[PDB]
Amino acid sequence: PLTALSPRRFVVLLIFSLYSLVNAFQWIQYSIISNVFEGFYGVTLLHIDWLSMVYMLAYVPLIFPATWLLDTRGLRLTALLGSGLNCLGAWIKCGSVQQHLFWVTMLGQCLCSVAQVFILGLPSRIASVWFGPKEVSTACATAVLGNQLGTAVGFLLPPVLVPNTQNDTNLLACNISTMFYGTSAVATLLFILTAIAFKEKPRYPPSQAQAALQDSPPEEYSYKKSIRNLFKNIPFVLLLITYGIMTGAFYSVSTLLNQMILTYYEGEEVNAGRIGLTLVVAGMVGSILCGLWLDYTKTYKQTTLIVYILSFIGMVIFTFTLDLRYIIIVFVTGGVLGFFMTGYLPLGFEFAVEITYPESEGTSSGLLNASAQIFGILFTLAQGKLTSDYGPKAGNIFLCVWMFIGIILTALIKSDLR
Ligand SMILES: CC(C)CCC[C@@H](C)[C@H]1CC[C@H]2[C@@H]3CC=C4C[C@@H](OC(=O)CCC(=O)O)CC[C@]4(C)[C@H]3CC[C@]12C
Numbered sequence: 001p002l003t004a005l006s007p008r009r010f011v012v013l014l015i016f017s018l019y020s021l022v023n024a025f026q027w028i029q030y031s032i033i034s035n036v037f038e039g040f041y042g043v044t045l046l047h048i049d050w051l052s053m054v055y056m057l058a059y060v061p062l063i064f065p066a067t068w069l070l071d072t073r074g075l076r077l078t079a080l081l082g083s084g085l086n087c088l089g090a091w092i093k094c095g096s097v098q099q100h101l102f103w104v105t106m107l108g109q110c111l112c113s114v115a116q117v118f119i120l121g122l123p124s125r126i127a128s129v130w131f132g133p134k135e136v137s138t139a140c141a142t143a144v145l146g147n148q149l150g151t152a153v154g155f156l157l158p159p160v161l162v163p164n165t166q167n168d169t170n171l172l173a174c175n176i177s178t179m180f181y182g183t184s185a186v187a188t189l190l191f192i193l194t195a196i197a198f199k200e201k202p203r204y205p206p207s208q209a210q211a212a213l214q215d216s217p218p219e220e221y222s223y224k225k226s227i228r229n230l231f232k233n234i235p236f237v238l239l240l241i242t243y244g245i246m247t248g249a250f251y252s253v254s255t256l257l258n259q260m261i262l263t264y265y266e267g268e269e270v271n272a273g274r275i276g277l278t279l280v281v282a283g284m285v286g287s288i289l290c291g292l293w294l295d296y297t298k299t300y301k302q303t304t305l306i307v308y309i310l311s312f313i314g315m316v317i318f319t320f321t322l323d324l325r326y327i328i329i330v331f332v333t334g335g336v337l338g339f340f341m342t343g344y345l346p347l348g349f350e351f352a353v354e355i356t357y358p359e360s361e362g363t364s365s366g367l368l369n370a371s372a373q374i375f376g377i378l379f380t381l382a383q384g385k386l387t388s389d390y391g392p393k394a395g396n397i398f399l400c401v402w403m404f405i406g407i408i409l410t411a412l413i414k415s416d417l418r
């Protein structure tokens with residue numbers, strides 16, 4: 001048919017990549033300065049850990065209903081839901097700046113968590129709907145890098161924005177209010193932009209395949225049947241477990257970074273945020289490089305196993321170098337660990353998608369993300385308890401053992417797939 005490329009696609013790609021980014025920020029704003037919020041609200045570190053774990057807890061039950069809603073009602077409703085929920089959560093947080101109003105900020109974080117469910121799976125759908133065959137992969141990569149950059153900014157900003165001033169509660173409240181109001185204003189602007197500009201689909205089909213998909217009549221899809229068939233697929237299950245372990249380890253490290261660093265270095269919250277930013281940026285660079293390598297070679301199993309082993313080595317090095325009382329070595333080890341660990345996620349995701357070619361990409365993506373969230377919750381809880389009881393090294397060694405198990409599982413996966 002007659003297919004054309006619409007300029008609005010770029011706007012559609014930009015606005016999403018922005019508000020998704022904001023969501024990622026709101027995920028890690030509390031954790032990076034978790035000590036400050038713990039002092040302000042008079043709560044335990046477990047409360048701040050739950051502020052991060054609410055995202056993971058909310059994603060798992062709502063992912064598949066969200067997928068059904070996206071399929072039935074289109075892209076515009078999902079985008080509006082995500083942006084509006086993020087803005088509402090930010091506004092709720094804005095009113096939670098008091099020593100006795102932790103539940104209000106928890107409600108706001110829950111709103112942002114529910115928003116996330118409408119955002120994570122949107123990249124591929126937007127790229128297919130609005131971009132031609134050559135630009136689909138680049139658009140999806142940019143969309144995911146948006147969330148990764150949001151996590152990096154969530155690492156970097158809060159430490160600078162909110163200094164640790166427990167002596168002066170009023171100054172702490174003022175700084176927290178400034179951060180919350182800035183985030184809420186950005187979220188409101190992004191929601192307004194999404195409402196004004198975001199559209200269901202371009203007037204022409206971006207690609208011949210998308211044109212055929214539009215022409216093809218809708219077909220009922222049974223998510224339960226697809227999930228059952230996927231679970232019958234043993235290599236897919238193994239890859240799911242390994243990817244979940246890796247992503248949960250990343251989530252736990254991100255959430256507990258402040259607790260680990262503050263144990264050995266005092267008054268280094270800004271440097272903790274910088275270390276998190278270095279981890280995320282090295283992860284993005286490694287993701288790009290590993291994507292190029294896999295596209296050039298297409299060796300799913302070999303590259304996956306090698307990257308898993310290197311990530312385990314980096315995690316062990318970080319574990320046994322954290323307490324050296326030198327922050328530069330912490331920077332370097334965090335950079336290497338982020339490189340290898342985060343560069344793995346796209347590789348494993350593509351391997352899982354290819355392994356389950358007959359099955360829909362949406363179901364496999366949702367299962368992978370749900371496994372990641374579950375492993376993140378488990379690792380966060382266990383590692384936080386271990387760090388509190390015995391010290392960061394215990395939880396780090398626990399993560400090392402889980403990464404070793406993940407390597408063993410990855411090696412077990414049997415597939416000649418390219
Ligand atoms: C609507 C969707 C997003 C689900 C919402 C779920 C949350 C509202 C729940 C899930 C788990 C809950 C947490 C589970 C465990 C704890 C530990 C609990 O700690 C104690 O009671 C002991 C505190 C101390 O050590 O003094 C305080 C509540 C809290 C943070 C809970 C707060 C509410 C949470 C985050």
Ligand SMILES: CC(C)CCC[C@@H](C)[C@H]1CC[C@H]2[C@@H]3CC=C4C[C@@H](OC(=O)CCC(=O)O)CC[C@]4(C)[C@H]3CC[C@]12C
Nearest residue numbers: 060061062064065223224227240241244367370371374
């Ligand atoms: C990675 C390992 C460690 C955990 C894997 C757990 C999964 C098997 C769970 C996680 C989320 C679950 C889903 C969450 C919500 C729903 C919606 C629920 O919808 C209904 O009740 C109606 C379905 C219909 O219309 O038939 C059906 C089960 C399902 C797909 C669940 C099936 C089981 C899932 C995929």
Ligand SMILES: CC(C)CCC[C@@H](C)[C@H]1CC[C@H]2[C@@H]3CC=C4C[C@@H](OC(=O)CCC(=O)O)CC[C@]4(C)[C@H]3CC[C@]12C
Nearest residue numbers: 382386389390391393394395396397398399401402405
């Ligand atoms: C796949 C899953 C089921 C494996 C789970 C294994 C855990 C139970 C292991 C992993 C890391 C272990 C911890 C690693 C290091 C330590 C420090 C150790 O410290 C000591 O008191 C002795 C050493 C010293 O003097 O420092 C006490 C045990 C503990 C908490 C270990 C307890 C057992 C842990 C949590």
Ligand SMILES: C[N+](C)(C)CCO
Nearest residue numbers: 023024027055056151
């Ligand atoms: C996708 N994030 C890393 C932003 C949240 C995990 O729950």
